[PDB]
Amino acid sequence: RYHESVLEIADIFDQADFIQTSDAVRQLRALMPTLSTSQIRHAIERIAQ
Amino acid sequence: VSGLLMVLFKVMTDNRLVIVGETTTPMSNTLSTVVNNVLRTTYHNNVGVN
Amino acid sequence: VHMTINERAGMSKLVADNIIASVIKSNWVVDIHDIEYTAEVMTPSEGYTQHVDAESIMTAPKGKLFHLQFMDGLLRPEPSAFDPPASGEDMRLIYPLQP
Amino acid sequence: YGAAVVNIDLNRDFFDTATGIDLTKGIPLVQDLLVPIGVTAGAEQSAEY
């Protein structure tokens, strides 16, 4: 019965101050190519300017 | 024979520490799948022949 | 052969000139996958401005989104009643494979 | 009367070229973010999406 992979979403908790971003950020991480480190600073540096 | 002695002598010297010369971090987007499977993260702009 | 490419990477010419030959003369339905592009449906009245070609849709790079543009062509009135027929009109080589 | 297609997308103005936002094609395309590393950029990149 081929398992099926989805997204949990941290609604198990039921919080306020804990639980901030939704699963949208997820799909967003999934789109971007794996960064290295200078590359994270490069992308971050570009945003600073 | 003296040739072997010299190619052995250069190996007894040498010396030669290595520093990281040139970095290239590609985009996984930009690489073919195989050349991405071999490649780890960064490479040197002069690769060799293998 | 609903053949589908993936790693349109190594491929060269020869084989790519051959698969285009084969999708024209033998009715194959090849298929790209790693060529993420951006489309813009542009309306009949005018033409297709930016025009590509299979010599170059295989011999194009890998993480580069090229821009193709399909045409709506739902708002283009009819031909006149009294005109000179046609003879062998054209169809169209590439389609998107989503909406 | 006689409009072919009327579609919706990102605003050309809000994300003016000022914030690097450039959707001249239809996608928010940035040029200063996840830039390459030890090499020049690709006249055009997806990653640019």
Side-chain angles (χ1 to χ4, degrees):
Chain A
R1 210 102 129 126
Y2 250 171
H3 72 61
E4 198 292 331
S5 163
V6 257
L7 260 80
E8 200 66 341
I9 229 191
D11 65 346
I12 21 256
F13 264 78
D14 320 274
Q15 255 91 294
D17 307 289
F18 326 75
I19 92 237
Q20 272 76 226
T21 86
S22 191
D23 91 54
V25 308
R26 186 102 251 148
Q27 225 142 204
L28 204 17
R29 193 158 140 291
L31 267 184
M32 53 184 48
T34 119
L35 305 175
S36 164
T37 258
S38 288
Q39 244 160 132
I40 279 178
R41 109 175 300 120
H42 193 330
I44 297 178
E45 221 139 84
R46 180 59 202 82
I47 297 184
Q49 81 105 332
Chain B
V1 177
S2 62
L4 287 178
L5 266 65
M6 290 302 296
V7 297
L8 178 64
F9 178 80
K10 294 305 289 184
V11 181
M12 183 182 74
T13 57
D14 183 358
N15 204 39
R16 287 197 291 109
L17 283 175
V18 182
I19 294 178
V20 179
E22 294 302 319
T23 296
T24 302
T25 65
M27 295 290 102
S28 299
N29 185 337
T30 57
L31 294 173
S32 177
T33 300
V34 56
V35 66
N36 188 24
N37 294 134
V38 51
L39 183 64
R40 291 175 177 171
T41 303
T42 72
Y43 59 89
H44 294 283
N45 284 285
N46 48 23
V47 293
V49 180
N50 197 30
Chain C
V1 284
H2 178 239
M3 187 172 248
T4 99
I5 352 283
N6 283 113
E7 171 285 292
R8 174 198 40 142
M11 269 231 332
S12 83
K13 304 286 248 47
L14 317 154
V15 167
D17 301 352
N18 202 77
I19 287 181
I20 291 332
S22 242
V23 59
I24 277 165
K25 236 195 284 262
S26 171
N27 288 73
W28 271 18
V29 168
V30 292
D31 205 314
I32 357 301
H33 261 347
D34 31 54
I35 175 196
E36 335 170 284
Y37 61 81
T38 168
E40 51 161 305
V41 341
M42 50 181 128
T43 191
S45 203
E46 101 302 48
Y48 280 75
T49 96
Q50 239 317 155
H51 239 9
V52 280
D53 62 332
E55 124 133 72
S56 133
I57 217 178
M58 310 260 207
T59 13
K62 215 253 200 195
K64 169 106 131 273
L65 35 46
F66 83 175
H67 161 94
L68 328 134
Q69 72 186 330
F70 320 92
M71 134 165 335
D72 166 292
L74 164 103
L75 212 98
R76 120 135 115 238
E78 339 103 283
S80 178
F82 287 120
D83 98 88
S87 288
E89 46 175 87
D90 67 352
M91 327 114 178
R92 77 179 273 196
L93 225 71
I94 61 192
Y95 312 79
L97 76 180
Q98 330 148 8
Chain D
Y1 182 55
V5 278
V6 270
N7 61 181
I8 51 143
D9 60 311
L10 279 311
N11 193 200
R12 187 188 273 185
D13 202 323
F14 201 72
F15 314 103
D16 326 312
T17 38
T19 46
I21 297 293
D22 186 50
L23 17 88
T24 73
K25 282 162 128 207
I27 298 279
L29 293 158
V30 83
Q31 323 240 158
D32 252 314
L33 223 294
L34 31 123
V35 72
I37 297 196
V39 201
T40 189
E44 191 61 59
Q45 286 210 233
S46 185
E48 284 186 307
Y49 157 78

